[PDB]
Scaffold this active site. Structure first.
Site, mmCIF file in Angstrom:
data_model
loop_
_atom_site.group_PDB
_atom_site.id
_atom_site.type_symbol
_atom_site.label_atom_id
_atom_site.label_comp_id
_atom_site.label_asym_id
_atom_site.label_seq_id
_atom_site.Cartn_x
_atom_site.Cartn_y
_atom_site.Cartn_z
ATOM 1 N N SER A 41 53.848 36.658 44.566
ATOM 2 C CA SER A 41 53.410 35.811 43.448
ATOM 3 C C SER A 41 51.965 36.039 43.014
ATOM 4 O O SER A 41 51.548 35.521 41.967
ATOM 5 C CB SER A 41 53.631 34.350 43.795
ATOM 6 O OG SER A 41 55.026 34.088 43.749
ATOM 7 N N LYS A 44 51.394 37.025 39.397
ATOM 8 C CA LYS A 44 51.301 36.039 38.315
ATOM 9 C C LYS A 44 49.884 35.987 37.776
ATOM 10 O O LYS A 44 49.705 35.591 36.605
ATOM 11 C CB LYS A 44 51.725 34.650 38.789
ATOM 12 C CG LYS A 44 53.246 34.562 39.060
ATOM 13 C CD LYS A 44 53.618 33.170 39.564
ATOM 14 C CE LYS A 44 55.131 32.982 39.666
ATOM 15 N NZ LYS A 44 55.608 33.510 40.978
ATOM 16 N N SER A 285 53.397 28.203 41.127
ATOM 17 C CA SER A 285 54.070 29.509 41.371
ATOM 18 C C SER A 285 55.435 29.519 40.675
ATOM 19 O O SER A 285 56.472 29.747 41.302
ATOM 20 C CB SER A 285 54.221 29.840 42.874
ATOM 21 O OG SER A 285 54.321 31.251 43.019
ATOM 22 N N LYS A 396 45.454 32.297 44.135
ATOM 23 C CA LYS A 396 46.905 32.332 43.975
ATOM 24 C C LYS A 396 47.554 32.844 45.266
ATOM 25 O O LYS A 396 47.159 33.891 45.806
ATOM 26 C CB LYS A 396 47.260 33.279 42.835
ATOM 27 C CG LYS A 396 48.742 33.334 42.494
ATOM 28 C CD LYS A 396 49.265 31.954 42.011
ATOM 29 C CE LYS A 396 50.787 31.996 41.878
ATOM 30 N NZ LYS A 396 51.435 31.770 43.195
#
Lengths: 456, 456
Positions: A41, A44, A285, A396
């Site tokens: 993730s 992203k 997420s 993140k």
């Protein structure tokens, strides 16, 4: 003391790590920073930057009802078109509302077909490299042009009173799915319980068959599944709302996949602004937001129906041309980081992070990342809390089977902001520790981020 | 000179390497030998060893026709059962032959149903971690209990004479599949050619829809696809052969999934011996043989319908208990190494290789591996040829997107046999070199194996 912290991690775990002052050219920590890794993730972060550059913070996804034809005495002489636009937030209620608007506009009857238009996108709604086995889970629901309530639905599975009888499925009547049970109910502690699986098998037109075994239980088992055919699903919801509103039609529900001139927009729904959605995406997420955005980027940049390949080419182009980042041999397969085909080095992600920091006053990007000890994925990241860095890390997370990544920013003891990328993969524990698997990670992170904070 | 050879490899490639004299306790080369990696088709080495230990070299897969009931005036009063046994080599002709035998036995008519029995296995025919996008390719055809001609079929796609008209599918009539074309034919050098994909979309009961675009061509495009529902496919072939043989039935074709007592075997087919099949598997990297074997191992060890999880548990148990190898935190998800969930360190694979070498006179295992410059996957491995090691390396290749592994044995200049494991992943080249991607690998291997051979 990177090598020593690695001893906290399971046998053979693979770390690639880079830490670098914002605006500096040389890293403070460099441990295999050039090595390719699965970003999970953290992908992203790239998706959010490329989206803001291509689409802007004020972009909104759009869904419309359009008429092609004259309306005579309440009868549309022609087709109703429902033009979907990959809005990941569209709800049943929005369809109901657009139908209410169509009715109020004077249409009581359609002398023609009802077209479900998904022409904004093309090809598969699943990116290359997604594991097949997760496709029926809601976190991996195909992010199609036609989405209603995240293309996720719930079901309750009841064991049969009598052992050997089929388990029973309860599902809300409004969901246009078809459920079948071939699930045999077993005695409470049976022989078959060990290796008899409980499986979901998707079929065409949103049919699902549950198979295998279920041991007797006092409570129904809640299950949630991903819709595989969003166009059919959205069509069935539209059909239901038309009927409830008393609008009749002579034709049938048909899919429209080819690009076509829009008719007269008679009803519409726009999403929240893109910046708001990117915030949700980064804080929580959200794979569906990431991947709808991703195929939208390609569609907007190349003026073609959005595909995974167009998305990938667009994101690479945007990073190189607008952000000054040549991602080289990096592979970008999707927006969410679900794909096992994604491959990127910490040093490449570092260039992305450095760009974001340099332009943060323009982008308002860092505020969207989870803040350790406050929100999103880092509200309680144990290693960061125990490192004393709550309120000092905006980053993140990226997790997949075997992968525990972090990428973002840390404000250190000196007040220096540092960008960092932690790519940790090949993470596995022995069978007898699989539901306790996170303790080595915590040990590692507690140590590393305390080190980074204290010494910089 | 491992670090220098790595400079031959693309930016950021990840190597974990171990080389060790047969029977020695310490390695001669150790570069990240403890680090977890994707094994790819080197997993088949483990599958072959565990298969020989559990099943033995003389095991044969079996398919039968069984009758349950009395035969009166040529009429079977009851059901015909076709009991499939995951034989990866079963052919249309074998079904035809077993039907001929059934006829010759005195059965002209079945007063009952025709049952396709797949009860030998249970749960999904696809292992966890297989990428969804490859499932329609023949190399990833679901290795089900019911296989006929590898559950692979071919088709010819013809562009339409007129641009804009649907492309045409030609398929042999004997294949029980249903093909639909929504493929638009494009002008020879068109605008849409760039981002319009040509896709296969599988549906229920072995339906396939081709979608997207095809530029005009003078020659039909050959395509081969994997059957998704082997039980239905095998049933349809059985139905066809029964009809051709003049055997009628009153019931229908039904699947039988639950374990049941065998009827009277009236016709049968057994595969070649397992050692022969393992040889094919290792020489040619045969995923279907690997994965049928894998679920068979679990079935035989635990006396349960074979599943992926039972296979994994069985292989771990066999390695620990019979081969003296505790694989620790290793993940085994399948037999073929297709799954992106497989994770194993060179040091663990090394223990497997050391066991095989020590017991080679019992197992006759090393003769099954590709021999460099002769056969299987290494017939022309450029790096090995250029290293001067043709005829001196017996090893299994493992390749997946981003992965180029080798595991096996080398006889060096001194005549010493060494086991070796090369796990090289995160391999990626820049877009403008993707169809030339193998040259860095060759450079690396030419150097490493020349080094190993010359200096040991």
């Amino acid at each position: 003391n990177v090598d020593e912290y690695i001893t906290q991690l399971p046998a053979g775990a693979n770390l690639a790590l880079m830490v670098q002052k914002v605006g500096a050219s040389a890293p403070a920590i460099d441990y295999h920073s050039q090595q390719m890794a699965l970003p999970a993730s953290t992908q992203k972060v790239i998706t959010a930057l490329a989206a803001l550059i291509q689409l802007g913070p004020d972009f909104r996804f759009t869904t419309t009802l359009e008429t092609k034809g004259n309306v005579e005495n309440g009868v549309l002489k022609g087709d109703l078109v429902a033009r979907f636009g990959a809005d990941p937030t569209l709800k049943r209620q929005d369809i109901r509302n657009m139908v209410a608007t169509l009715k109020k506009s004077g249409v009581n009857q359609i002398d023609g077909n009802v077209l479900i238009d998904t022409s904004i996108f093309a090809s598969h709604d699943k990116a290359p490299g997604w594991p097949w086995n997760d496709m029926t889970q809601c976190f991996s629901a195909p992010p199609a042009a036609a989405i209603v309530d995240r293309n996720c639905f719930s079901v309750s599975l009841y064991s049969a009173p009598k052992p050997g009888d089929m388990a029973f499925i309860r599902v809300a009547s409004y969901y246009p799915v078809t459920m079948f049970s071939q699930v045999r109910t077993l005695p409470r502690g049976s022989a078959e319980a060990q290796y008899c699986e409980l499986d979901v098998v998707p079929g065409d037109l949103n049919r699902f068959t549950l198979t295998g075994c279920l041991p007797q239980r006092s409570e129904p088992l809640p299950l949630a599944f991903a819709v595989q055919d969003g166009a059919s699903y959205a069509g069935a919801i539209l059909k239901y709302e038309l009927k409830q509103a008393g609008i009749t039609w002579s034709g049938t529900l048909l899919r429209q996949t080819q690009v076509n001139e829009p008719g007269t927009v008679v009803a519409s729904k726009q999403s929240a602004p893109l910046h708001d959605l990117l915030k949700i995406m980064l804080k929580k997420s959200d794979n569906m937001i990431a991947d709808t955005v991703f195929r939208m980027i390609g569609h907007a940049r190349f003026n073609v129906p959005g595909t995974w390949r167009a998305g990938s080419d667009a994101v690479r182009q945007i990073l190189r041309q607008q952000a000054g980042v040549d991602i080289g041999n990096t592979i970008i397969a999707d927006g969410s980081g679900l794909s096992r085909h994604n491959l990127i080095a910490p040093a490449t992600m570092m260039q992305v992070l450095q760009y974001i920091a340099q332009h943060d006053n323009e982008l308002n990007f860092i505020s969207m990342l989870p803040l350790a000890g406050y929100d999103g994925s880092l509200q309680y990241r144990a290693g960061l809390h125990q490192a004393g860095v709550d309120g000092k890390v905006s980053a993140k997370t990226g997790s997949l089977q075997g992968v525990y990544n972090l990428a973002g920013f840390i404000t250190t003891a000196s007040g220096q902001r540092m960008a960092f990328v932690q790519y940790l993969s090949g993470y596995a524990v022995e069978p007898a520790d699989q539901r306790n698997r996170r303790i080595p990670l915590v040990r590692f992170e507690s140590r590393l981020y305390k080190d980074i904070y204290q010494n910089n």
